[PDB]
Every structure is written in C-alpha cells, then in structure tokens.
Design a binder for this molecule. Sequence first.
Ligand SMILES: CC(C)CCC[C@@H](C)[C@H]1CC[C@H]2[C@@H]3CC=C4C[C@@H](O)CC[C@]4(C)[C@H]3CC[C@]12C
Ligand SMILES: CC(C)CCC[C@@H](C)[C@H]1CC[C@H]2[C@@H]3CC=C4C[C@@H](O)CC[C@]4(C)[C@H]3CC[C@]12C
Ligand SMILES: N[C@](CC1c2ccccc2Oc2ccccc21)(C(=O)O)[C@H]1C[C@@H]1C(=O)O
Ligand SMILES: N[C@](CC1c2ccccc2Oc2ccccc21)(C(=O)O)[C@H]1C[C@@H]1C(=O)O
Ligand SMILES: *[C@@H]1O[C@H](CO)[C@@H](O)[C@H](O)[C@H]1NC(C)=O
Ligand SMILES: *[C@@H]1O[C@H](CO)[C@@H](O)[C@H](O)[C@H]1NC(C)=O
Lengths: 762, 765
Amino acid sequence: KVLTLEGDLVLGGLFPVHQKGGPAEDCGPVNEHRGIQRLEAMLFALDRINRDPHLLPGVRLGAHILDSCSKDTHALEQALDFVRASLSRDAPTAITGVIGGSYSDVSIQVANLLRLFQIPQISYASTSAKLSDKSRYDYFARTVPPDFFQAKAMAEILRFFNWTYVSTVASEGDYGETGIEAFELEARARNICVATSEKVGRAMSRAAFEGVVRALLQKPSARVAVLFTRSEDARELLAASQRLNASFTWVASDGWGALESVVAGSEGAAEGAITIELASYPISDFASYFQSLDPWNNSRNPWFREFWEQRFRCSFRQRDCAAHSLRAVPFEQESKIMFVVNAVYAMAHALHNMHRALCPNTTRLCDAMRPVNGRRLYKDFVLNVKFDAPFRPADTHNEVRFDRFGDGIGRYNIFTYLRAGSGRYRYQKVGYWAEGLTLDTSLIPWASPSAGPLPASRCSEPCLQNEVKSVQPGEVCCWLCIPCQPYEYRLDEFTCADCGLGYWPNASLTGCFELPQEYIRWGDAWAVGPVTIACLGALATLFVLGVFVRHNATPVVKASGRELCYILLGGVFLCYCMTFIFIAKPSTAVCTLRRLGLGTAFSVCYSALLTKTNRIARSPASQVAICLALISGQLLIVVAWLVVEAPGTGKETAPERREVVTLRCNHRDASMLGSLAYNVLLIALCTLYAFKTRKCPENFNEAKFIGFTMYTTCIIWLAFLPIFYVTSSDYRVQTTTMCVSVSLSGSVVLGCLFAPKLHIIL
Amino acid sequence: RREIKIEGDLVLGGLFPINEKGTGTEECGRINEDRGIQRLEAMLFAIDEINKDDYLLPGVKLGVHILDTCSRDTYALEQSLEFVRASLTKNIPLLIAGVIGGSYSSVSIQVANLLRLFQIPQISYASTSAKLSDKSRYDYFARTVPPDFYQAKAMAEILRFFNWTYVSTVASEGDYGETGIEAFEQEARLRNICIATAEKVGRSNIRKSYDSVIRELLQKPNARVVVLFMRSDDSRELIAAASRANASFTWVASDGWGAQESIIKGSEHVAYGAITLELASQPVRQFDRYFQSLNPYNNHRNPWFRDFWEQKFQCSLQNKRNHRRVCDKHLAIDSSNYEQESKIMFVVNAVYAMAHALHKMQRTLCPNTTKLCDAMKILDGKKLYKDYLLKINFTAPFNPNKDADSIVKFDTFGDGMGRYNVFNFQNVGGKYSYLKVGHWAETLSLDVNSIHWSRNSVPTSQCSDPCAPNEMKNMQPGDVCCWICIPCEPYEYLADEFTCMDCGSGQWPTADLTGCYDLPEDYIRWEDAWAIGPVTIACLGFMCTCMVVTVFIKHNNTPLVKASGRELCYILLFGVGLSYCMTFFFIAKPSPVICALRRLGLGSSFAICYSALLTKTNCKFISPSSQVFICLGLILVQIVMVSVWLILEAPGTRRYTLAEKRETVILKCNVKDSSMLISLTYDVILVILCTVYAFKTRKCPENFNEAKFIGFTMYTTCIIWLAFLPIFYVTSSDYRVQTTTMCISVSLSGFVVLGCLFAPKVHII
Ligand SMILES: CC(C)CCC[C@@H](C)[C@H]1CC[C@H]2[C@@H]3CC=C4C[C@@H](O)CC[C@]4(C)[C@H]3CC[C@]12C
Ligand SMILES: CC(C)CCC[C@@H](C)[C@H]1CC[C@H]2[C@@H]3CC=C4C[C@@H](O)CC[C@]4(C)[C@H]3CC[C@]12C
Ligand SMILES: N[C@](CC1c2ccccc2Oc2ccccc21)(C(=O)O)[C@H]1C[C@@H]1C(=O)O
Ligand SMILES: N[C@](CC1c2ccccc2Oc2ccccc21)(C(=O)O)[C@H]1C[C@@H]1C(=O)O
Ligand SMILES: *[C@@H]1O[C@H](CO)[C@@H](O)[C@H](O)[C@H]1NC(C)=O
Ligand SMILES: *[C@@H]1O[C@H](CO)[C@@H](O)[C@H](O)[C@H]1NC(C)=O
C-alpha cells in the first residue's frame, strides 16, 4: 500500500500509520495521531511547497510515502523500495531524499540501510542520542533535539537552585539509561553529587516501586529527585509515593511532560514538580487543512478509509455514517506536526539551493541536476540551512538550522505543577531552555520562597578551619564538621595535623610555628626575698673576712682554723652565688654549674665541719689535706655526674599546652636526686664524726655552738629535699624554696662560726 | 548479467572479482584470470566435494548463487541485493543460508554493512582489513584469513628476537599502510622499541620523493634496520631508489613484498638480508587436476568460462571461429603451465566451514533424520552464526599435506589464526632467490642457520650501548627514548637513573652509587706515626713533677728557696704539672670538652708565666699573700676571658671542596678558636717580656744566683715564644705534624722553665 504520486523530484516518507500488532498481523490498529496526522502534515507541506512561487517555483515535488507498521524489519523492507530506484539495472521512482522515521530503532535501521546508497534522511520524531555520530549515520538529519539536551537543561536547573545532592531514577531501556549516563557526565562537569541510582524497568509489580520509594526515603538529606522515566514508569512511582506518603521535589523529563495521566490519583505526591517538555507551537493552517478532510474527496490517502472506520466506529458497507467531519471537538493537533513541516521545508530548501547553485540559467530541473548526488547534497545544502520556520507565530526564536551532527536546535519548555488555585491543579510554563536558563521565579510553587524552599544538600555547611572535614563512608562527596584538638592545626581537608610538641597553633591553623616563650621562669615579685637574703649573707661574709684579717693580734690565729674560716667563708659565698644563679634564667650550662656549685659548696661546709673530727682524733696541714681530698673527690663525682648527664635544654614536662616548657635543663630529675642524696650522706657522716668526738674543751666557747648548729643545718638540708618530692612537679616554687634553704643554712653556718669573734668583740 | 545458479536444499552466496575494476568508459573490464576465475572454480570444486561427501551434509545438497563484483564496491553492493531479496517473503528467488565474502576489503565492508541488516552470515577468504574486526559494525562477518596487524605483531617479535630497538619505519598512503604502521607503532611501544623516522611514500610519486625518503633514512646511521609495511609497487620503486643511491639497509617487509620477484628485479644488490613475511598456504593437489581438466565445451556451468578461455588463449570461439584464432582442442590448461593461486585453500576452508556450520545446526535442531525438516526451512542467521560458526573445530579439508596447524577455526572476532612464513633473500652460487627461514603461527621459529646470520654479521640497530649508572650517567639531548652516556664524578651518586646527585662534604657516595654513607671520621693520632709521642712527652713531665714534689716535701725542713718564695715555687710546680696534662689533651678525640680542656691548658700556661713574672716582683708574708691574691685574680680574669670566647662550641666541620677525598678530617671543635688562641698567646708573650725587662737583679734575698736563674728562665720563655710565633700561622692544617710540633714546643718550654729552678735546691743542700 502506497500513496505515491509522479513528480520531477520525489521525496520518500516513513510513518507509523499502523501500530505494532505483534506476530498476528505484523501491525495492528491504525495510529490516528502518530501515523495519520503526521502523514497529512507532510502532504499539506508538500502541497504548500508546490504552491509556493518562492521555493522551487519551476520544479514540482513528488511523494513516495510508505508505512513501517511501527517495526524495524518492516521499515527495512519498505526502504528497500526506496533503494530499488537508483540501481543501474510497479515502476521505480527516483528519491532525492526521505522524510521518515518516528521511532529510534526504525530510524536507525533506515539510516543504516540508506547510508550505503547515498540517500539523505531527515527525521521528525526520533530523539535517540546514538544517532548523532557520523561514523555510522552520515546521511541522517534531525529537526528535533537529541535526548541529552534535556539532561543538560536539568543539570543547569539543579545548578541554578544550588541543588548538589539529588536522587536519580532511570529506566531499563535505552531511554533512561542514556539520559542517566548523560546526567552523570553533566553532573561531574558541574560538580553535582548523586545519592542513589535505581532502575524502575517495566513488567515489575508494585513491590519494586515500593522498595525504590523506601530506598529514596532512607535519605532525608536528598529532597530533590530526577526522573528519567517513561509515562508508565513514572505513574507507578508517583502512585507508590502518594500511597506511602512520600514528598519530593521531582525534576522530570519529556517522559512526564505536561501529561495529566501521570498525576491522575497522585496529585499530592506530584506537588511542586519541575518538568521538561519539548517546545512547539500549533499550526493553524494545518488544523484548517485537517478539518476539511472527508473519505470521499481525500482519495490520495489509502489509509484514510481505515482511519475513518476505526475512529468513528463506522463501516462503508453498512452506510452507518453519512455526515461526519473532524471538527475542533474530536481533533487535537499533535506536538510534532511542526517538526514534520520543518523537515519537509528544510529538504525543499536544500533542493532549491542545489537547483540555484547548479544551473542558475533557468528555473527548471536541468539535465545536470537530474543525477542527484546525495553525499554532496547532505554535506553542502542540507546541513547549511538558515530559514524561518513556515507558519511560525512570528517569534524571532523560531529558526530552522542543523548542527554539525545534523541535529535540531534544543528548545524545551519548563513546567511546574501548580496548586496555587481555588480548587484546580494544573501545569504552568515557567521558563524555557534554548541555550541558557530563563526562569520565572515568581510562581515556582515550593521551589521558590513564599511557599517553603526545598534545599538539596548532602550534609551541613562547609566547615571552618577549627574542625576536621571528615568524609562519611556512606556519603563520600561532602564532609562533616567535627572539632579537633585545640593544639592540632588543620593542615588540609584530611584532618588536623600537629602544630608541634609544644607549639601553640596560629589563628589560621595552617602555619603556626608558635612555640611559647618562658624565659622569665621566676617572677621578680617572688625573686626579692632570696636576693635580699643572699646580699645580706654576702655582706656578713665580707664583714667576717675583714674582722678575721684585722684579728691578726688575737692569740687564736695559727692554733685556730683561720684557713678553715676562710674556706668556710668561700663556701658560703659559693653557695650564695649558686642560689642566685639558680634563681635566675636557666641556660644550657647553668643547670650543670648549679649542681656542681651546690655539691662543691656542700663539700666545703662538710669539710669544715669535719675539721672538728680531725681535732677530736688528735699537724694543722693534715686537716687542710683532708678537706682538699674531700673537695677533690666531690669535684670528681660531680664531673662524672655531668658526664653521665650532659648539659641540654628542652624540658617540656607539661603536655597541657598551658605551659609546654618551663625553661630548666634537659637533665633528668633523678640526677638532681642523686646529688642531694650524696650531699645528705656526706652531712650525715660529718654529723656522726662530730658526735663521735671525745670529751675535750677545744675552745668550748666556739665548739659548743658549732656542734649545736651543725645538726640543725644538716637537718634543714635533709628536709629541704623532700619538699620537691612532695609537690611531685618541678616548678619555680621548688627552686626558690631550695635557694632560700641553702642561703639560710649558709647564713646559720657563718653566724655560728663567727659567734666567738662577736662574743670577744664585746 | 551472468549468474551461476545450482538447485539444492541450501544455497550459499558467492562474490568474486571475476572482472577487473571498470575503466573510465565501461563499468567493468577484462576478466581477472587469477583472482576471480580460479577462486570461483575452487568454490565450485569445494561445493561438489561437499555434495558428494558422505560424512558432511549426507542428505542436504548445497547450491550456489555466485555473483560478479567487477572489483568495485558499488557494483558489489548493487549485486548483493539479490541475496537479500529472497528473505523478504512479501527469476525465482533462492534462499541464501550464507554468503562467501569478496576479496577486496572495501567490497567486503560494503557487503557486510548491507548483510548485517538482514541477518545473513558472511565468511571471507581474502579480506585482511582491521576495520572488519569491529563487531559493533560487522557482527555478521567472518574470515578464514588473519587481519593485517598480525603481520605488525610478527615484525615486532622478529625485531625483539634480534635485539633491534632503534629502527626506521616506512609506510604507504591509503588505509592498509596506515593501519599497518599504526599497529606496528603500538606493538613497538609495547615492546620498548624506538622509532627513528616515520617516512611516507604516498601513492604515486616521481622518482624523487623515493630518493628523499632514502636520504632521510640514511640521515640516522644508528638505525640500520628498515621496517616496511607498504604496497607491492611502491616497494619496487623504493628498492630502485635505494639501488640508484649507495645504501646498505636490512628490510623487514610485509606481505606486500613477500616472495615476489617483481620487487627484486634489476636491483639485486640492495636487498640481500631482507626479512619478508608471507601468508602461509598449501596447494590443494585436487584443485590443479580439477582446473586442468576444464574445457569450454564440457563446462557450461560457468558463464564466464568461455570469455576467460577466449581471452587467455587469444582465440575466438564458435561465435565467429575465424576472427583471430581457433580455440581448438589442442589448446588446454593441462598442456599449458599452470600455477595454483595462493588463496585457494582459504576459499576451500571458508566453504567447508559454512558446510560444517550447516551440518552442526542440522544435527542439533533437526535430529533423527538426515533431511531438511520444517524446523530448519527458514535459516536463522544470528543463531547459526553465533552458535555454529565462531565455534568450529575441524581439520583442513585437504590436510594430507602434512602440517600441524591444519585446524580451521575462528576467534571471538571471527578472524582466522595468523600463520605467516618468514623468508630471506639469499645467495647460493650467484643465483638470486628467496628461502623460507621460519614461520609465525603463535611464536617465532626462525632457523638462524638458514638466515646466514642476517647478512654478514648480525646487524646492529641499537641507539648506543646500555649505560651503567655505577660509573657514568646518561642524558637525552635530542632523542627521547635512547640515551648517551655522560661520566659521573666519583664524589657524586646516582639518586635517579638519569641524574647524578652529590652527597656533599657531609657524606660520601656509596659503592653501589645508590645513596650516601657516613664518611670516615677525622684521622686518629693514637695509632698514627707519633703513637708514642704523647707517652714519651708525659714521661719527662711526670718525672719532672715527681722531682718537684720531692724537692717541695724536702723543703719543709731547713728551707732554702721557701723563704717567702714557697707559694711562688708551688705555683710554678703546679703550672709545670698542668702543662703535662695540657700537652696530652691535644691528641684526645674531637670533643667540645676536650678542646675546652686544651684551651684551659693554654690558660694555665699563661697563669704559670704570670706567676713566674710575679716571682721577680717580690724584690714577710702579707706582701707574698698580696702577690698570690693578685696572680689569682689574673688567672680568674684569664678564665673569664676563656669563658667569654667559649660560647656555643660548634663541631667545626672541615675538608671543604678544596680537598675532597674519601676521608675527611675535622678539628676538635669550631675552627673559630684561632683568634682566641692568638689572643691568649699574646698574654704569655707580654708577661714574659715584662718579666725580662723587670729582671734587674739588683737585689739578692739569699743569693745572686736566684736572680740570675730567674733572668735565664725569662729568656727561655721569650725564645720559645718568638721561635714558635711563625709556626702559629704557617701550620694551619689538621695533619699530625701541626699538633705534634706545638705539643713538643710547649713541653720543651715547660721543661726548660722548671729545670733551672731545681738547680739551686741541690746546690744549697
Ligand atoms: C677544676 C679542674 C680540676 C677541672 C675540672 C673539670 C671541668 C672543667 C670539666 C669536667 C667536665 C666538663 C664538662 C663535660 C661535658 C661538657 C659538655 C660539652 O657539650 C660542653 C662542655 C662540658 C659542659 C664540659 C665543661 C668542662 C667540665 C665541667
Ligand atoms: C669549681 C669552681 C668553684 C671553680 C671552677 C669553675 C669552672 C669549673 C667553671 C667556671 C666557668 C665554667 C664554664 C662557663 C661556660 C661554659 C660554656 C658552656 O657551653 C660549656 C661549659 C663551660 C665551658 C663552663 C665549664 C665550667 C667552668 C670552666
Ligand atoms: N522521540 C521519541 C523519544 C522516545 C521516548 C520518549 C519518552 C519516553 C520513552 C521514549 O522511548 C525512546 C527510547 C529511545 C529513544 C527515544 C525514545 C523517539 O521515538 O525517538 C518518541 C517520541 C517519538 C515518537 O515516537 O513520536
Ligand atoms: N587482503 C587484501 C589485502 C590488501 C592489500 C595487500 C597488499 C597491498 C595492498 C593492499 O590493499 C589493501 C587495503 C586495505 C586492506 C587490505 C588490502 C584485501 O584486499 O583485503 C588483498 C589480498 C586480497 C586480494 O585482493 O586477494
Ligand atoms: C545559589 O547560590 C548563589 C551563590 O553561589 C546565590 O547567589 C543564589 O541566590 C542561590 N540560589 C538560590 C538560593 O536559589
Ligand atoms: C638478545 O639479548 C639477550 C640478552 O638480553 C641474549 O640472551 C640473546 O641471545 C640476544 N639475541 C640475539 C643476539 O640474537
């Protein structure tokens, strides 16, 4: 069955006149909207072109239109008829180009078959994304946009509202799978994170849809979902959401559109849904042509009789219908009629351009143009078209042109599901997407203010430098705000790195290098009493030395310990200096000399106290030799001490970060304990030797006082040490107490030594 | 048009280049007597063999529908529509179970593109295009011949076998040469083979572009091996160009060259060690007898046979019988010389593979009878192909020609298994001919003895020898892949395999040249030449100290020099004893404490000199006590200055780039102590000079000898200070001599100052 008519230039056509009826008849009922209306639109466009004195004014366009029965194999068989006209071998009619293909598979098969024979093809309803590659279809053109332009539009919509975390729902077939794939490409090109990706393929019962709804709802951080679903794959999902009481801000595609069959019974679930639909306008001339159609006068169309019989349930044998017509009430213009008209007019314009370029001498089909070269036609005159769309609403945006892939211009209409009426629910065009978004934020139910905005964020707001940005194992893309330790600076997004062992972090927590300074370990407020005591002791020692020098006339100069008194005064001065330097700022060598000075001073006083033991047993030089040997032994033990306890600094004992370092020396506290233990042992030995003395006066005016004071001084020295251990934490208090105790012991020793001189003075 | 139709249960399609490509006037031309007629007769012979066979398709008789493509893709595409017109069910049509593909790659590509829509399996026998291996476009296409990238793989394997990494590649224009050269580039970069030059010869050029290509190849003498994947006429042109020029290259060629004598004609000196690949094939001895027994009268099955007969023998048949010559029974193919085509076994294999697939499908789907049944009437191309064509495993139909790789099977892409023959152009006694030296079925099997070691001596095709980083480094001046050695200094190490790094003065490069190790420390003088030097020096000092101590002990009773000079002599003895410890601390190991003790030794020497000067200042006990206090204060000031210049003693690294050896010597501590030593030594000289001037010797407390002894000792200190002053600056090295000289000088000074003081003690007693 064919409606072909003779013409100088015959144009092919493929329409789904008959719906697919399965294996019973290879095609069933007549398609009254996708096969009849589009075919009549093509016929009307051809008639208008033939009646147009500005487009092909001398050559008459023909038509050779077949029916594909909505199947690929039947389409291939029909396209074989188109092919069998140019072979070098009813009556074949040469076809310059074909305007056919309403299904993606049919168009793909037709393009594959016609590519080998150099026949250009322009489609009107095929939106497959894999028809855009010229490596497989280099003679295929489209007046409709592909299926990824809507994906780009929805990605731009998501970016406009700052929706980064969204849920994705796709279908099982090519439509939905290609859309979702383009969606990840556009999202990763626009930094949009994806929560879930499920499939809602057909032939599934209610349980699958309920499970999908539950999986979507087990994520309260994703309130926006994109639906790459067909009409039947979206109606069931909306019904499941409505019956399960699920609320989402759906961002749908052309599968939903402005159809009212998806929101039937599920108005609550579909509230505030942004939907993308292809932009098109009705043609009044085509409608007027279609109204004045009857089965008696329209003898060109062979399928018109069957269409009339099926639509009105009439029969031409029983004369059931006599006076019927397709008026406004039973007629509704299809949305892709203007695309068919545009395809036909683009083919006519390409033919006119070739006719003008080849033989401009006359406005008639010349002999040179009789052999039509499809390759040159498609490469030059089909792809390079720039003309206003016929029967347009006179808008300047309706311009027909093909891209380098032979695709149409992507122009979609943005729709929303209004509830802002009295009691009626309806759609509204609230923007469009040609190359950029032009939204009308005013109405925008839900997704705009004055109705409750819907944000789509993976997690909380971006964290500051004071907390760790932690990546959740469940949700990788965003990060959570978890405070780190106050002394741990945030080096990067991973975690808070360590500023240092004892270094305070900076304000920005990126480069700190801020080690607190504690050079003044002992405050001047407390470093006054010990200083005054040391000064008084030094003055007393100087006065005693001066008196002893002036006491040469006294009988007790050689028999008495004048050299012993000088040694005791030197030891008192040494311990006073050691206390003064230990109550000062510590240094690397200061700690070593403080221990050495304390030990040497303790040895000097112990040796002076040991002089009574030598006199108790019995030459004056013997006591000097004994004290020198004791001092040498103490010096050697101190030398071994700091050899095993080499000088250093960096005693960061406290990790509380309030005071990381308290100055002091790096030497271990056990080393100080050993020196004090040795000094206490020496003092105990000296006291035992003094108590072991026999009964002899030996200048009892001075011996009794020295013996009474030595025990007290040694007890004070032995009780000073546990003060540090009781606190169990070395600080400025322990140093001051130790210095005060040492100075007091030295002053007491000097006073008891000089008491006979003071007594004899009066 | 003419067609070959034979009735049968199953009809197999066929496309052969019977006629050559059409000229500028007609759509066809002369009959291709070799590629078309011989292959068509091979297909007919195989079909007859299968039909009369007993174990293959016993009940099904195969027919053919053979068409002529005229060596054009458009004509073949138009003709192949007869194959698909019978599967529409919408000049009786004949069902086509399968189509035997064409010879030319474009013809096969177009036929596969048309047949994939109608689900018709296709097996080719001569198509070797890598584009046909794409199952996204040719999912219904198969071939018994391997594609053309297996030749590139074989070339890469051959180059790897002979250790040739720097080679030059020349290709042709079009698609065959392009695909082959890209495949060879992929294989070479997979096997780490450098590409020197990528030259192109185009399609048709005058004999100047070939000379330019030859000169460009000669521009890199390091690459003496040329890889050719290029056609069978441009190869001859390049050989002629290289013959006109004076060049000596080894060629690794493809099936374009092969064993053909057209390439070598007239230029049999340039090509002497060439490696050429050829598709391995075997002659079917039955086909020669079948073709030789063919006559234009008894063979009416082939409509093209009469024209082929009248063209080959240049005679006229019964149409006129007297135009040019009579095609009498005397003229025959048996009498004339006949050579079987190299691609007859491939046609036979394709036909037998299709027959085996049909037989397997018949046994599977239609059992219990050896006849065509209802379930097998319509042919399912997809099922047949994907189940019984890619999964064939059967030996060659005419395998009696002994060969291990006689199995016919297809891989996942439908291509055949690559079995290539490696040839070599060799000499025997002046005769120029090829010789097979190996084969490439799955791995190389070259017979190196037959190759004559690839001409005289094995050719070298490497860009410089491999370079050992242990001794010298490598860089890439202009060539990215290969390298040229550059010497690496012994004091540097190879941190990476391209760049040498320097350890510096801190460490020395390791023997393996993979890092740095702790260089040996400073020279130890304990086991040096002066090992017993300090021991001998201390022995004299110890004896002098013991003698001084004995004299001092004996001085308690009946004092001689202890009359107000006891403190002075004790101080002098203490200084002399401290000098012995000072001269022994110089050899001690480098330590801050060791060098602090060394400086304290000089301080003690200065204190001893000050005390000696104070000895003359005496001329009671209060005044000697004041002098003792004064000299103690002077020593305290000296110690204070020592502590002042002793702050943050650095280790004192030495052995800079001036003397960069394996062993680096360093001082005891920071080398900034030279100024401190110079300042300290000035005090000793100053006090010695003051004592010398103050040695008036105008008073004798006990004897005039003591003043004379003091004056004599004053001169010795000045003499030793002045003599060693030049040695202070000239000796500025860490060698043993510098320290030993100083220690010997100070020990001698300490001995001489103390020796004269002991003389009066012995004389008085
Ligand atoms: C008075 C006479 C007997 C000499 C006594 C020996 C004195 C001077 C010696 C004995 C141990 C020595 C210390 C041992 C180790 C060190 C660490 C080093 O990094 C700096 C020097 C320093 C801190 C030394 C200074 C000098 C020292 C205190
Ligand atoms: C024992 C007492 C009573 C008298 C002798 C004091 C001696 C041992 C003291 C006085 C000055 C001190 C020096 C002062 C400063 C430094 C620099 C330091 O980086 C290492 C220790 C060192 C080199 C000290 C070593 C010990 C020292 C020489
Ligand atoms: N333009 C469509 C788009 C189509 C489609 C649209 C929405 C839902 C499912 C769906 O099925 C697929 C599958 C793959 C590619 C395109 C689609 C075409 O057939 O190509 C279809 C309207 C055209 C028509 O038949 O009139
Ligand atoms: N197998 C070939 C290989 C062929 C070829 C071989 C050598 C030189 C040039 C050349 O042209 C091309 C170009 C592209 C792919 C293959 C080739 C084919 O035509 O496919 C050809 C042997 C088959 C036959 O004609 O008997
Ligand atoms: C999205 O964020 C931008 C700032 O990046 C802001 O200007 C804009 O108003 C936001 N859009 C909303 C909230 O719809
Ligand atoms: C190639 O080099 C390997 C060592 O890497 C050697 O074993 C082999 O024999 C060489 N092949 C030759 C010289 O043909």
